[PDB]
Design a protein around this ligand. Structure first.
Ligand SMILES: [Mg+2]
Ligand SMILES: [Mg+2]
Lengths: 279, 289
C-alpha cells in the first residue's frame, strides 16, 4: 500500500516522517515543493516526489500509483487563498485513482467559529464528502509547541495576554498528533471515520500558572484587547487579526473540545503541558 | 433603515419582494443583474440598483447607503465557482458600511453532507462568523414548488425516481420561506440568530402517494441509480451529478431536518404538499370537454 505524505517538511510533516522512518513503514512517499530541500537524513529512507500545493498538475503526477494520501494543510491565509489546495487535492486524488485520503484538519471549524481559517476547514470537510473518495478526517487541537519559543517573551512581560476571556482551550503536542496519524495509517480498520486528537484543556489562568512554574518566572493572565493583540503581532500583514480571532474563538468557548481518540488509537495518554515544557 | 434584497427577480426573491410590498416595508431596495426583468408593478414601490455578484465593485456600489442586506445566493456551480459571491458580500458590506446581513442558505450543509454545494454553504456561514459583521443565518428546507412542473413527467413514468433510498426529506414552499424571511426583516429582535425554515418531512413513499392522489394517476416510488438520475437530468453540464448528490444526501437521512422557527416567526402552520398541489386543478394530458 503506497502512502504519500504531503507537506512532509513542515512542522507536523517532519514528526510524521521521522516516526514512519523509525517504524520502518513500507512504501512511504513524501511530497515536497522543491526536492533539494529534503533532509539529508531522509535520503534513501523515503521516496521523494515533487509536489506544489498550488500547481494542480504537480499533484496529479505526484499521486500516480498512490493508495493513501495524508494531506497537511498549508499556512496560507486567508481562507480564500488556501481553498485552491483542497480543490487540487480532490482533483488529483480522483484523476490518479487515490483510494483513501487522511486529511489533517484544525478543530476551530464550527459553523459559528470566528477564527479566520474556519471557512477553509468547513469547506475542506464538505468537499471531501462530495468527492466520493474514502477519507479519514482528523481534527487536531491547538499546538503546544509554540509555547516553548514564546516563553522568553512571556517571562519578559510577566504576563500572558491572549484575548481569550475566561474560555478553556484544548492543547496537544505535534508529536502526539503525529502519533495518532501514524496509528491511523497503520490500521485500515480506523479509516473512514472522523477523529479529534485532543490533549488537555486549560483556561488562561491555569495556562499562566503552568508557564510560571516551568520558567520559574511569575506570569499572570492579563489579557489585552483583540485590537491591541492583533496590532502588536501583525506580522506578516493580516496575521495579527487572524491570530487574535483564534483566541476570540476560545473566549466563546469553541476551543474546549475533548475526546479519547488519542488513547483509543495510540493506547496511551497524551503528553501534558507540564511534561512537554519540562522536556 | 435601508434594506436591500439581492437577487430579487429570482424565484424566491420575487416572493420576498411582493410580500415586502404587500407589508408596506419602506426603504426597500433591490439589487438585480438585469433591471429590465423587474416587474412594472414594482416601479415606485422599491428602489432598483444593478448588481453583479461576481464583480466586487458592483457589490460595493450597490451597498452604499444600505443598512441591512438580505442575500440570496446564486445557482452557480460548483462550490469553488460560487465562493467569490460570499467573499464579495462581506467585502462590500464592510467597505460600504452595511450593519447587518441576513443570509439565505440551504439546509444541506453539514460537515458530511454529500450535496455538491455543501462546501459553499459551510464556507458562507463561517465567513460571516469571521467577518465581525452582525448577521442572521436563515437555513431553508427543499422547495416544494418544483414538484408541480415535474408532475407531467412523473405521471408519464408512473414512478418517482429520486435516488433517496428510504430517507425522509423536509420540504417547504417558497411562499412559506418568504413569509419567514419577511417576519425576520420586520422584527429586528429576531436578528443575530440562526434559523431553519422547515415545512414537512416525507419519505419518498409518502411523496409518491401524495402526487398520485393529487394527479389522479398511479405513481409508485421506484428510485433509479445515482448515475442514471444524473444522466437523464444533466443540464447544464455538471448539474446532473449535483442534483443526484442532493437526493443522495436524503438517502443518508441528512435532509430530515425540522424546527419550530416557522411557527414561532409567522405564527402559523406551514403549507402541506397536498394543500400546495390542491392550489389549482392540475392540467391533465387528456381533454375533459
Ligand atoms: Mg519551498
Ligand atoms: Mg472504499
Amino acid at each position: 500500500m503506497n502512502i504519500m505524505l504531503t507537506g512532509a517538511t513542515g512542522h507536523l510533516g517532519t514528526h510524521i516522517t521521522n516516526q514512519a522512518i523509525a517504524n520502518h513503514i513500507d512504501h512511504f512517499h513524501i511530497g515536497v515543493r522543491n526536492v533539494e530541500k529534503v533532509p539529508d537524513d531522509w535520503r534513501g529512507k523515503v521516496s521523494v516526489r515533487q509536489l506544489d500545493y498550488f500547481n494542480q498538475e504537480s499533484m496529479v503526477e505526484a499521486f500516480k500509483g498512490m493508495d493513501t494520501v495524508v494531506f497537511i494543510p498549508s499556512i496560507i491565509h486567508p481562507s480564500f487563498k488556501r481553498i485552491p489546495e483542497v480543490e487540487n487535492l480532490v482533483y488529483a486524488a480522483k484523476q490518479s485513482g487515490v483510494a483513501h485520503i487522511i486529511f489533517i484538519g484544525y478543530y476551530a471549524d464550527q459553523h459559528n467559529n470566528p477564527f479566520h481559517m474556519s471557512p477553509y476547514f468547513g469547506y475542506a470537510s464538505r468537499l471531501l464528502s462530495t468527492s466520493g473518495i474514502d477519507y479519514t478526517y482528523v481534527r487536531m487541537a491547538m499546538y503546544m509547541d509554540p509555547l516553548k519559543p514564546y516563553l522568553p517573551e512571556l517571562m519578559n512581560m510577566h504576563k500572558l495576554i491572549y484575548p481569550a476571556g475566561d474560555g478553556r482551550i484544548n492543547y496537544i503536542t505535534r508529536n502526539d498528533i503525529a502519533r495518532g496519524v501514524i496509528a491511523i495509517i497503520k490500521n485500515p480498520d480506523t479509516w473512514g471515520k472522523r477523529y479529534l486528537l485532543s490533549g488537555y484543556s486549560y483556561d488562561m489562568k491555569e495556562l499562566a500558572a503552568i508557564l510560571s512554574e516551568a520558567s520559574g518566572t511569575e506570569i499572570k493572565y492579563e489579557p489585552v484587547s483583540l485590537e491591541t493583540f492583533a496590532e502588536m503581532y501583525d506580522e506578516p500583514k493580516g496575521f495579527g487579526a487572524l491570530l487574535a480571532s483564534m483566541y476570540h474563538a476560545g473566549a466563546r468557548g469553541l476551543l474546549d473540545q475533548e475526546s479519547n481518540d488519542f488513547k483509543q488509537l495510540v493506547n496511551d495518554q497524551p503528553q501534558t503541558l507540564q511534561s512537554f515544557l519540562q522536556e
